[PDB]
Design a protein around this nucleic acid. Sequence first.
RNA 1: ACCGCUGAAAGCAUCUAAGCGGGAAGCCAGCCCCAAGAUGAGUUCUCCCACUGUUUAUCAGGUAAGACUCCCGGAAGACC
RNA 2: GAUGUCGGCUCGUCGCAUCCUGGGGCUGAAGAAGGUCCCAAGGGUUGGGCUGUUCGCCCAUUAAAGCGGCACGCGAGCUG
RNA 3: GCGAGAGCUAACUUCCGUAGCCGAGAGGGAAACAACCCAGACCAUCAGCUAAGGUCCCUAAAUGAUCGCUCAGUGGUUAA
Lengths: 171, 142, 205, 58
Amino acid sequence: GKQPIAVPSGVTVNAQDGVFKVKGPKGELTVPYNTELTVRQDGDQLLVERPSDAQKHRALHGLTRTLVANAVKGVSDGYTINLELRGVGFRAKLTGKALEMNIGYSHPVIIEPPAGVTFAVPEPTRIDVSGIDKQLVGQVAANVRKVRKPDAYHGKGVRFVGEQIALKAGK
Amino acid sequence: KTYIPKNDEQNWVVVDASGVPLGRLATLIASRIRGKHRPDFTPNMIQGDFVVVINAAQVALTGKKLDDKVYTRYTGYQGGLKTETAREALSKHPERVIEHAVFGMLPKGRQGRAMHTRLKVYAGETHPHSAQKPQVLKTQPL
Amino acid sequence: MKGILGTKIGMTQIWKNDRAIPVTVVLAGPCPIVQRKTAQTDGYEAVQIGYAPKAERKVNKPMQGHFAKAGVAPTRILREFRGFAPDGDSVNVDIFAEGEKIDATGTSKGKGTQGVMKRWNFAGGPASHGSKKWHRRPGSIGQRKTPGRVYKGKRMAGHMGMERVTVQNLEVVEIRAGENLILVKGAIPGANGGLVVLRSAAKAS
Amino acid sequence: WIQRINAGARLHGMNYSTFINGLKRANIDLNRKVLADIAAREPEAFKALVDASRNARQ
RNA sequence: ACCGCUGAAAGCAUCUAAGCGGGAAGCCAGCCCCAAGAUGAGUUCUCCCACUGUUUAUCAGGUAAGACUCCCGGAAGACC
RNA sequence: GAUGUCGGCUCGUCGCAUCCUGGGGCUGAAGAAGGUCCCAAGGGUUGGGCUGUUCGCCCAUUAAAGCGGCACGCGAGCUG
RNA sequence: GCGAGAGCUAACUUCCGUAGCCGAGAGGGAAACAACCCAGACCAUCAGCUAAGGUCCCUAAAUGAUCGCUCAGUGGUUAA
Ligand SMILES: [Mg+2]
Ligand SMILES: [Mg+2]
Ligand SMILES: [Mg+2]
Ligand SMILES: [Mg+2]
Ligand SMILES: [Mg+2]
Ligand SMILES: [Mg+2]
Ligand SMILES: [Mg+2]
Ligand SMILES: [Mg+2]
Ligand SMILES: [Mg+2]
Ligand SMILES: [Mg+2]
Ligand SMILES: [Mg+2]
Ligand SMILES: [Mg+2]
Ligand SMILES: [Mg+2]
Ligand SMILES: [Mg+2]
Ligand SMILES: [Mg+2]
Ligand SMILES: [Mg+2]
Ligand SMILES: [Mg+2]
Ligand SMILES: [Mg+2]
Ligand SMILES: [Mg+2]
């Protein structure tokens, strides 16, 4: 189970209604939150309690908390995912903002970053997906990776840096 | 002997269907239409009131129904029996859901058919019958 | 959008570069504006124009009033084209360039009440294998006690033709402009001295 | 007769069953044909019979 | 079908139990044709007008705009 | 005091326990080509030789040459 | 329906036994429905209470009251 909420000193999670909204320094947000359980600040910290305790109540508990959590750690720290391209010469860049994936496909695949998120390159065989949301960035890197899931033979594809991949091996 | 009346009046109302289960508003309106709330009630006369429904767009249907609720319109033609989700028909043409409901709840003979006409079906909060001065009916069980 | 009206004049053989293209000649003598319908006026987005001219005498009163509402002189024929606009009055120059694919609509040549063959391409019957009085007849209409009916729309003898037919992606070989003559690749349905409407293609490719 | 009475009752706040029951309770032994008649041709009378039935009910 | 994002119950893990993305020759829409007898009968432009007849005759008559009738024909069609 | 039967021919249209085509999981799946299972019924499913034959065997092709229901569909439709 | 036999603890199956029902039984109920649940129609009535069975609208009668369950449209057809 879970309760403790650690807010920094430049937050403002205006806990009105059920639409418990935030406006952190790393760009403000708007976050859709459960009404029938209620949550607010109690000084320097903050808390999300729950009414009844059958079982279905016990979900939107740890759910909603970890969600507002995601908001906090997002408007403060921000978010980021490291991606790497492995395989016979795979490469990506930047069309202003669009992701220039060149992944051993007869005709190139380029992607367009929705709002809130932004793209990033270091050495071209790596992509850094960063933005204010933590859902959305997940919901984007998901796609980028899903341009070519690392195959089960050489492990050639797109992956989360450290990520181990197991390798069947063939003939 | 018993008192057979004479159909003056022609009385009008506004059912706001915003946020009400279908079946319920369905019988409320079906009843106001049939006439049954008229103590001078009469079975071969269509005494009933005129019903103006607003916001048939914003009716309440209890989940998951609008992703389960089929509507089957057979066409004479093989491969006719076409379908439609409740949300489909709702975004398409919502007054044809409300119409469809109220119409199962009214007699299927010469009368009932004719009664259908006493239904005026809309969406949002707008009707062109401001000339008929409809009395804003409510939502209760009385 | 793109559209105009004219007559089916004839099928003929002509050459571009080296090949026998077969071309049907349409005419699209100037069409005049007559009615310009917009949403706030008539709900939907269109324009009514007109083809073959007509002398004031053989003309109705109402139709006269109409044609006079925008000083036009009567056309024996009216028609609408959805989502147009122009400015002035409407010929084929400014409307087609040579080579542009186009959708050409006419009425067919109709054939009267027609056989199961001619109409719908039925099989037939063994013209000599004992086959009493069954040479041209479509055989069976159904099954049996189930369903016990005959299907809706079951093809069978019927008036064939005089349908409204559209043929798709046709190519403007040639524009004899200001002779309002149009050359078009291939077929176009419905008889010579025909009434046809050349509209832009429906599609893209 | 029945549906007309049901109507009547409901026209104020009563059920048919409750009206008719409080009109069994105060022993007001009226035929229901008559009750229809009262109900649809005679307003304030139906009113009173109502107030009665309800009184005797509680 | 399936693939995933955020993610609690079950401090971990989880595509799911709240929500969200992707996903077929299939469904709906898009394409061609019919279509207001859609009796819920729609919309638009234009035209003729406000005629006459003791209701001893509370509805007819003569007409306008327009149309048929009839002749002559047709790449329309058995007749229509 | 009559519900005419096999097979062909004509005509069709439904079921999905899917032959092809489309999508996916597994693979003893390197690739190519496959096995097998989940979703999927829009369209498609060749021409002959022998036999009344359905069926089945063979010729030659094919993306495929699917299985069944419609009184073992269909004689006031023909064969016979 | 309960008893057993032949059957395959198949049949709107058949051959006994046993109760009721239809046959020779209308009336209400079970949507519809000889057999089932209520019930045995001497005529008349624009009169009242009940049975089985019901009481959101079609369709008479509580969208009743309080303690609960299931969220699967289960209800509204089966099993290891
Ligand atoms: Mg002809
Ligand atoms: Mg032949
Ligand atoms: Mg039938
Ligand atoms: Mg999509
Ligand atoms: Mg016979
Ligand atoms: Mg299947
Ligand atoms: Mg098929
Ligand atoms: Mg058989
Ligand atoms: Mg047969
Ligand atoms: Mg027969
Ligand atoms: Mg023989
Ligand atoms: Mg026997
Ligand atoms: Mg006997
Ligand atoms: Mg009986
Ligand atoms: Mg009975
Ligand atoms: Mg009955
Ligand atoms: Mg029986
Ligand atoms: Mg009882
Ligand atoms: Mg009732």
